Amino acid sequence: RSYPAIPRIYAETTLNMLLKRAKKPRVHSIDEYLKDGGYQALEKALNMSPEEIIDWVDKSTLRGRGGAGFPTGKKWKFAVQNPGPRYFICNADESEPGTFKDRIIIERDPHLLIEGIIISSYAIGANEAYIYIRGEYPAGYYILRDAIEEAKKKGFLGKNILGSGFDLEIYVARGAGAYICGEETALIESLEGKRGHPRLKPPYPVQKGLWGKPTVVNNVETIANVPFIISMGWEEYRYIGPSDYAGPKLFPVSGKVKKPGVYELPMNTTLREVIFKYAGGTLGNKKVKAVFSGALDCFSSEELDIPMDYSPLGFGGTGTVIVLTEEDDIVEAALKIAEFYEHETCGQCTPCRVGCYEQANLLEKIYKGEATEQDWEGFDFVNRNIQPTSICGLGAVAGRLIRQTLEKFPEEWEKYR
Amino acid sequence: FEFPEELKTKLQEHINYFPKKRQAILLCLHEIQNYYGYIPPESLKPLADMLELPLNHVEGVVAFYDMFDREDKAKYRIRVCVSIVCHLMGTNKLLKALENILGIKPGEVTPDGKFKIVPVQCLGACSEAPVFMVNDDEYKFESEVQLNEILSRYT
Ligand SMILES: NC(=O)c1ccc[n+]([C@@H]2O[C@H](COP(=O)([O-])OP(=O)(O)OC[C@H]3O[C@@H](n4cnc5c(N)ncnc54)[C@H](O)[C@@H]3O)[C@@H](O)[C@H]2O)c1
Ligand SMILES: Cc1cc2nc3c(=O)[nH]c(=O)nc-3n(C[C@H](O)[C@H](O)[C@H](O)COP(=O)(O)O)c2cc1C
Ligand code: SF4
Ligand code: FES
Ligand code: NA
């Protein structure tokens, strides 16, 4: 009943799907959820074969909401081609700067996530599922534990669920400070009771994951879509947004906007529409300088008319929109991005370990005007050399946003020289 | 060293929760830090035995996970987000306000061992920047008068 204090993040929807309940900043318990027809998609799914559910999730065109956009049906298909036992993992590590879309599902509509996990686990033949939630989401952790007990009490979990013969237990694990533990193989190691160190891929978790068994790892938002695909059928789900990038999408908008918060919109919405049509424009009506897609990409004011989809020219990523205005120093902002990667590298790979450290250390010198000419040259080189030999996406992107600021805002970097 | 019954019962609960005992390490350590206000170096050996893991394994886990502090005892941990959105919206104003109220800077502990400022990476509440946590509770910093009132709730 009593949970730790959680800020009341503003949430607005045009689709009334993922935020049907989560648009209200409060826990929605099982009675409230059931009144909205909750757990009926699970009932329908338990009367379908695991194979039909995979086919439906495939045909819906649902792509991973964690940031990489891998087709969900396709992922499940790879796992089920491998013998059992299989494991299902809900990734609730959400630690990307500017990213707060998942937590509002967890904290306000936990039964939407739970129902999605049960359908997904049934579809892949997993009798054991996990929620790995970042340690900095303690309220989300107690909210999920309470909602899981409510589901067990209503017979949605445990042995022979609703007389289907399908068994399922959901275990909630907590992270403990590491951004890298959201990387799906580091998450699996942490779930195994070890340090959050990413594994060399391939194998992908679907071939060899938790305890070396076929494992599906899906983001909170991806899983929250599964009850909607089953409830409305894949065809009606595909009517939402463009047919090539279908369904609802959560957009966590922050920074220099009048209305920061989470927006549920179709993926054909443009970045400019997200800021100006939905987030109320900029604070003080000051000109947009840049948009940071988390700690992954940097878009200039010349790139605002792009769609918020998984297309090559689209925004992509998690859909995270951090708005910087004309008075925000791009180098000071780049320093914040460099400091993030410095703090989060697991240090397994030498160029990532040294590269993340040096990029932040040299960028600080540059910013403070204490950099030598060799420091400027070393900084340029280290930034273009974090990726070599990396075994996870962190080393591959630790220099991406910063390089884009160098290319898109050369005038500002030039004054720091 | 022996864990108090009230804590030992909570640790046994986390250990019997997951299908394998070793899967409970992080939940056990969070519980140890909640109880003591830090990770006492002495607690690691009985925990390793309860998890059926070697001490070296437990030591490496404690070293890896940044939420765990085996150095400073503190009743209340003020986690201050130092990442990009919060820096843009006023981390420095929040840290200035904290220095004025408690007399401490990040990484420091108040003389009475009541409060410790812990600088942290993005806390996933960026629309509410600048964000801070006081143990498990999370808030948007508004001003010094406002922060003063929040901190007064922690006795
Ligand atoms: N949401 C957050 O808080 C957060 C934080 C940090 C990073 N990220 C995101 O993480 C993304 C990178 O993730 P990644 O390294 O997992 O990316 P990825 O493109 O390599 O893979 C995405 C998913 O598809 C699966 N997959 C890919 N190829 C496969 C294949 N051949 N066979 C089977 N499965 C396959 C992977 O196992 C994974 O589950 C970034 O775009 C970033 O936005 C998100
Ligand atoms: C360093 C790093 C951190 C990641 N953190 C997260 C995270 O917090 N949440 C998430 O769902 N995916 C995260 N990912 C992506 C996962 O590895 C993976 O792609 C995803 O969980 C699969 O789910 P999806 O297909 O539903 O998106 C991270 C990737 C990397 C490289
Ligand atoms: S690229 Fe960096 S974060 Fe990823 S496994 Fe290598 S050292 Fe660790
Ligand atoms: S940058 Fe501080 S909460 Fe995200
Ligand atoms: Na984590």
Numbering used by the authors:
A (entry chain B): 2 to 418
B (entry chain A): 6 to 160
Sentences copied from the publication:
Complex I couples the transfer of two electrons from NADH to ubiquinone (Q) with the translocation of four protons across the membrane. The L-shaped complex is structured into a peripheral arm that protrudes into the aqueous milieu and catalyzes electron transfer with one FMN and 8–10 iron–sulfur ([Fe–S]) clusters, and a membrane arm embedded in the lipid bilayer that mediates proton translocation. We have determined structures of the electron-input module of complex I from the hyperthermophilic bacterium Aquifex aeolicus, encompassing subunits NuoE and NuoF that contain the FMN cofactor, the [4Fe–4S] cluster N3, and the [2Fe–2S] cluster N1a, respectively, both in the air-oxidized and dithionite-reduced states at resolutions up to 1.8 Å. Here, we show that the redox state of N1a regulates NADH oxidation in complex I by inducing a conformational change close to the NADH-binding site.
To determine the mode of nucleotide binding, crystals of NuoEF were soaked with NAD+, with NADH and with NADH plus dithionite, leading to refined models at 2.0, 1.8, and 1.9 Å resolution, respectively. The structures of NADH and NADH plus dithionite-reduced NuoEF were virtually identical. Noteworthy, in the NAD+-bound state, the peptide bond between E95F and S96F faces the FMN as in the oxidized protein without nucleotide, while in the NADH-bound state, the peptide bond is pointing toward the loop coordinating N1a as it is in the structure of the reduced protein without nucleotide. Remarkably, the reduced nicotinamide group penetrates significantly deeper into the binding pocket than its oxidized form placing it in an optimal position for hydride transfer. The amide carbon atom protrudes 1.65 Å deeper into the binding pocket changing its distance to the Cα carbon atom of Glu95F from 5.37 Å to 4.03 Å. The two positions of the nicotinamide in the binding pocket are here called tight (NADH in reduced NuoEF) and loose (NAD+ in oxidized NuoEF). Water molecules that are here resolved for the first time play an important role in substrate binding by forming hydrogen bonds between NADH and NuoF. The E97F side chain binds the NO2' of NADH by a connecting water molecule. One water molecule bridges the backbone amide of G394F and the side chain of E184F with the NO1 of NADH. In NuoEF, the carbonyl group faces cluster N1a in the reduced state enabling binding of the nicotinamide in the tight position.
